[PDB]
Amino acid sequence: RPTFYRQELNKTIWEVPERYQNLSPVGSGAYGSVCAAFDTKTGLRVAVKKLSRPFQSIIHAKRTYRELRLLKHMKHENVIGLLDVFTPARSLEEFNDVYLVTHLMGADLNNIVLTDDHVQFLIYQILRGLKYIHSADIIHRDLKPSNLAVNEDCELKILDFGLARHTDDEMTGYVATRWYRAPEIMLNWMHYNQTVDIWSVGCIMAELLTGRTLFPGTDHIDQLKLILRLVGTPGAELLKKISSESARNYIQSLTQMPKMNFANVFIGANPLAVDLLEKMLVLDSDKRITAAQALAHAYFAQYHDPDDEPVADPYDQSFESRDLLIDEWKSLTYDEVISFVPPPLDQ
Ligand SMILES: Cc1ccc(NC(=O)c2ccoc2)cc1-n1cnc2ccc(N3CCN(C)CC3)cc2c1=O
């Protein structure tokens, strides 16, 4: 067991192993504050998130367990991984604090915004990342530029997947961003699958190509209006699939937009880039390209290697459907701290 040391970094008492040095706060991550630090053990720059009141409620408690489970499972270049997890607690009884340590990528995709080859590389890495998380039946749900971490090599990792609530029957505290959300999760108007994340990739890729937010909607309805202006009102075959009677009512009432020519919207874009965008930004949940299929699209010829696009090990999210006391979520998280083994360090 290591020696810890305490400091006050903006409201909060950080208590961390002596191994981590020169903590300097960089803002909020998912459910708590993040410090940049220096890892004396590895010589590396790391990010330390202190979860804010991890065990105040069932929601915080379950979400704490979820995040730690998520992180401990991901092992892939384009998906953030767990370098370390720790507590100052010396027993389960006094266990009150969780700190999660990952690599510090220099930046995220806001800060960056770009040539076509740059967009190829970055979107390529996102889809390579999504294939792996999708293959474990995990869905990001709020993929967006601020949770795409990038270093100066344009090497990219996805953060914060799997947190934004599954249905509207649950609350996880996590706040999504309107502009990158698939119309089906935003509005809950047909069922949804992993391709909610492909819609997002569509929106991010477009933005990288034009500098403009694709759909800067000011609310749910304005957002839906912006979207239909580009893709057109849904056809009779799409209407067939809308499960809600109010959504279908609303749509069939809007005065009808035609689908536009994506070439006349993405003018000056590489035509392969345009073709992919048309395959990503389709209303129909069953028709939208998947991560795997997008990886094989001509746009990515320079990057695609079927033998280096791995899938994940099976991930057991049966805990998701359980209804347990705060102390039960709490002890489960404790087990997961104690059993943590850090990634191997070669020379
Ligand atoms: C350190 C850390 C620990 C855990 C998690 N959890 C997940 O990614 C995740 C995946 C599934 O569920 C949760 C993420 C992080 N993490 C890693 N690196 C970061 C780098 C920078 C920042 N900040 C960038 C600047 N911004 C103003 C505030 C956030 C933030 C971060 C940042 O939050």
Whether 184 is in the pocket of ligand 1, judged by its Cβ within 6 Å, is no
Q: Do the annotations mark residue 268 as ligand-binding? A: no
CA–centroid distance, 158 to ligand 1, in Å, is: 9
**CA nearest to 230, candidates 251, 259, 200:** 259
Q: Where are the beta strands (DSSP E) in 30-167?
A: 32-39, 44-51, 84-86, 99-103, 107-108, 148-150, 156-158
- Nearest residue by C-alpha to atom 31 in ligand 1: 29
Determine the Cα–Cα distance for residues 142 and 163; give it in Å rounded to an integer: 9
Give the ligand 1 atom nearest the CA of 108. Answer: 24
Token pair of 28 as six digits: 């909020």
C-beta separation of 45 from 104 below 8 A:
yes
Whether 138 is in the pocket of ligand 1, judged by its Cβ within 6 Å, is no
> What letter would DSSP give residue 264?
T
Whether 150 is in the pocket of ligand 1, judged by its Cβ within 6 Å, is no
The H-or-E segment that residue 82 falls in is: none
Determine the Cα–Cα distance for residues 144 and 181; give it in Å rounded to an integer: 8
Neighbour-count burial of 146, counting CB atoms closer than 10 A to its CB (0-12 exposed, 13-18 middle, 19+ buried): middle
3-class SS of residue 85: strand
Alpha-carbon distances, residue 184 vs 98, 131, 187, 237 (angstroms): 34, 20, 5, 16
Mutate to test the pocket of ligand 1, among 46, 159, 161 (most ligand atoms within 8 A of CB): 159
Rounded to 5 degrees, what are φ and ψ at 49?
Answer: -95, 120
Domain boundaries along the sequence of the chain? 1-106+312-341, 107-311
Neighbour-count burial of 71, counting CB atoms closer than 10 A to its CB (0-12 exposed, 13-18 middle, 19+ buried): buried
Catalytic member of 160, 168, 197, 316: 160
Token pair of 149 as six digits: 């971490």
The structure was resolved experimentally with: X-ray
- Strands of the sheet containing 32-39, edge to edge, are 20-29, 32-39, 44-51, 99-103, 84-86
- Nearest residue by C-alpha to atom 27 in ligand 1: 27
- Nearest residue by C-alpha to atom 2 in ligand 1: 49
Q: Do the annotations mark residue 240 as ligand-binding? A: no
- Nearest residue by C-alpha to atom 4 in ligand 1: 100
Give the ligand 1 atom nearest the CA of 102. Answer: 1
Q: Is 160 a catalytic residue?
A: yes
Residues followed by a gap in the chain, C→N > 2.5 Å: 113
3-class SS of residue 226: helix
Determine the Cα–Cα distance for residues 273 and 209; give it in Å rounded to an integer: 9
Fold designation for 1-106+312-341: Phosphorylase Kinase; domain 1 (3.30.200)
Q: Do the annotations mark residue 164 as ligand-binding? A: no
Q: Do the annotations mark residue 27 as ligand-binding? A: yes
Whether 30 is in the pocket of ligand 1, judged by its Cβ within 6 Å, is yes
Alpha-carbon distances, residue 269 vs 13, 55, 85, 259, 294 (angstroms): 50, 49, 44, 19, 18
Documented resolution in Å: 2.3
Instruction: Give, to the nearest 10 degrees, the angle between helix 196-210 and helix 271-280.
Output: 150
Query: What's domain 107-311's architecture?
Result: Orthogonal Bundle (1.10)
Which distant-in-sequence residues (6+ apart) come within 8 Å of 268 by Cβ? none
- Give the CA dihedral 190, 196, 199, 204, nearest 10 degrees: 150
- Nearest residue by C-alpha to atom 13 in ligand 1: 160
The H-or-E segment that residue 15 falls in is: strand 12-17
Whether 136 is in the pocket of ligand 1, judged by its Cβ within 6 Å, is no
Whether 285 is in the pocket of ligand 1, judged by its Cβ within 6 Å, is no
Q: Do the annotations mark residue 49 as ligand-binding? A: yes
Determine the Cα–Cα distance for residues 262 and 275; give it in Å rounded to an integer: 8
C-beta separation of 76 from 310 below 8 A:
yes
